[PDB]
């Protein structure tokens, strides 16, 4: 373990006192002077790969660009890379990433009226409250992880059609799985009414 290694942990570079072991879930910056290695674990996350690459260029431009950056895929290391260390090995260590899933409080939810006069379909934001759901239109409740299509008792078939489709596009935009729920006026579950503040 002659070369200086920086282990990626939670958006910072911690330099190890004894390099050599490499965790499959993590990323490392191997600094060996004029050669700089990005060791990228096959199960590492995007924040870890990113800091490794950005830090390398910073290290390289720190040394007037003379250094040579290479990338090593973990688990397919070249023999000359492994011999850099007294006894190199692979482990299953995985420091969790920094990036968080977005979470919305109920008061951040947004309610939207879907009304078609005869020519065109309107999509408007309305005050976030049960007292905004009018029986004549369709209302789309954006609850981040959940999308509710509320069909008033007197909505047009096409307002229910269109409102359903723009719910599908909410789910297409957003990472992960969003549950779209078609609910009828007078049949809406407890969980829907809770999505208002």
């Amino acid at each position: 373990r002659e070369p200086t290694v920086y282990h990626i942990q939670k958006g910072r570079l911690v330099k190890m006192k004894d390099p050599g072991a490499f965790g499959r879930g993590d990323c490392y910056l191997v600094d060996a002077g004029m050669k700089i290695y990005l060791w990228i674990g096959p199960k590492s996350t995007v924040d870890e790969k990113f800091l490794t690459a950005a830090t390398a260029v910073m290290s390289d431009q720190s040394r007037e660009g003379k250094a040579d950056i290479d990338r090593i895929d973990g688990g397919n290391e070249p023999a000359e890379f492994k011999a850099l260390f007294d006894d190199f090995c692979l482990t299953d260590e995985d420091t969790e990433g920094i990036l968080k899933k977005v979470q919305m409080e109920t008061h951040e939810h947004r309610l939207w009226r879907v009304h078609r006069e005869g020519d065109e379909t309107f999509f408007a934001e309305v005050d976030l409250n049960k007292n905004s759901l009018k029986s004549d239109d369709v209302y789309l409740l954006d609850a981040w992880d959940d999308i509710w299509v509320w069909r008033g008792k007197d909505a047009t078939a096409r307002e229910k059609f269109d409102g359903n489709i723009l719910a599908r596009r909410y789910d297409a935009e957003r990472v992960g799985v969003q549950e779209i729920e078609i609910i009828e006026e007078g049949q809406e579950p407890e969980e829907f009414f809770k999505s208002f503040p």
């Binding site: 995007v46 790969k49 990113f50 390289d60 950056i69 990338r71 065109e120 059609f161 990472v175 992960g176």
Partner: protein, 356 residues
């Protein structure tokens, strides 16, 4: 908290640094009467407005409407006070110096941001893949770019452009689904075409064999169910649509496909570094999301590459938003606060400090 806005030709991506996904995504469209309507409302109000794209091929062209995009990003979609947050912007390949001083000036004088930074989309996606060196294929809504990057720096002389991307594929898919006997005129019906594009289309490994397979059976046909229980049935259109990326002639474009523009981009770099680009082809952008595209690229660049050259195509799982996620990491890293441009320096050096 910092804010990350990735301004694209068809879609604005915006959210908070530290988030793993952008929470605001809306069309980069502004509609004025035949005083302004922005984003989804602009699209929805299609029958009575003129829709303009302020960004064309990743470069900003209509400044007035761009501020309405940014105004709409801050006040309507994220509902934040720009005076409260350092804001990270992104920029296209070959973005002229003047455009980006103008991005800076507008940020500080119109939106009074405390600090800002402009990062290059291709490098963000490359870093996000775990690379300092590679050739990025960036296929978005309005433009496809081949961006060779050597150890953190794009090579401007070798950058290739294909005036073709997701919006032409949507339009082409609409055209050939019409030839099946369907109609797509209203706003909801146009979203169905684009929803079908993003869910059932794919790039075939060998096109003409896929056409034969589609002709000799209904093996590859797939059905898209509409809210009212109707079904839209699609056969060789699943792969004819994204095939356009490899055969631009499908939409009447006399251009080389994306595999050829990748090869052409590498070939314009010095012989010393082509070995590193052939082995680090990184996909980014919404249109690099079709299943089958990497395997197809691998086969096609292998057919054009020198013998014994090692070819690798990397298609990271998050490439739909890889620019924005990269910027989310950057603006959220302790090590990067150094190069935040504060309002103080802009007061002294003017907009010209951004290049430095």
């Amino acid at each position: 908290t910092a804010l990350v806005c990735d301004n694209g030709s068809g879609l604005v991506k915006a959210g908070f640094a530290g988030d793993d996904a952008p929470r605001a995504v809306f069309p980069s469209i502004v509609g004025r009467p035949r005083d302004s309507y922005v984003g989804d409302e602009a699209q929805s109000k299609r029958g009575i407005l003129t829709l303009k794209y302020p960004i064309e091929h990743g470069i900003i062209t209509n400044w007035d409407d761009m501020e309405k995009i940014w105004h709409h990003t801050f006040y309507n979609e994220l509902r934040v006070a720009p005076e409260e947050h350092p804001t990270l912007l992104t920029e296209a390949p070959l973005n002229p110096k003047a455009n980006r001083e103008k991005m800076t000036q507008i940020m500080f004088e119109t939106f009074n941001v405390p600090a800002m930074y402009v990062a290059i989309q291709a490098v963000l996606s490359l870093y996000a893949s775990g690379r300092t060196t590679g050739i990025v294929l960036d296929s978005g809504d309005g433009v496809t770019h081949n961006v060779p990057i050597y150890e953190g720096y794009a090579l401007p002389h070798a950058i290739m452009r294909l005036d073709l991307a997701g919006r032409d594929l949507t339009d082409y898919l609409m055209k050939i689904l019409t030839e099946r006997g369907y109609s797509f005129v209203t706003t909801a019906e146009r979203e169905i075409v684009r929803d079908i594009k993003e869910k059932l289309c794919y790039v075939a490994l060998d096109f003409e064999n896929e056409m034969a397979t589609a002709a000799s059976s209904s093996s590859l046909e797939k059905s898209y169910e509409l809210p009212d229980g109707q079904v839209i049935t699609i056969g060789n259109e699943r792969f004819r649509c994204p095939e356009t990326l490899f055969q631009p002639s499908f939409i009447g474009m006399e251009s080389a496909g994306i595999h050829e523009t990748t090869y052409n981009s590498i070939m314009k770099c010095d012989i010393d570094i082509r070995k590193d680009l052939y082995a680090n082809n990184v996909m980014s952008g919404g249109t690099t999301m079709y299943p089958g595209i990497a395997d197809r690229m691998q086969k096609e660049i292998t057919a054009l590459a020198p013998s014994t050259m090692k070819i690798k195509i990397i298609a990271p799982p998050e490439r739909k938003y890889s620019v924005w996620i990269g910027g989310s990491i950057l603006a959220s890293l302790s090590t990067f606060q150094q190069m935040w441009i504060t309002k103080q320096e802009y007061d002294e050096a003017g907009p010209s400090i951004v290049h430095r």
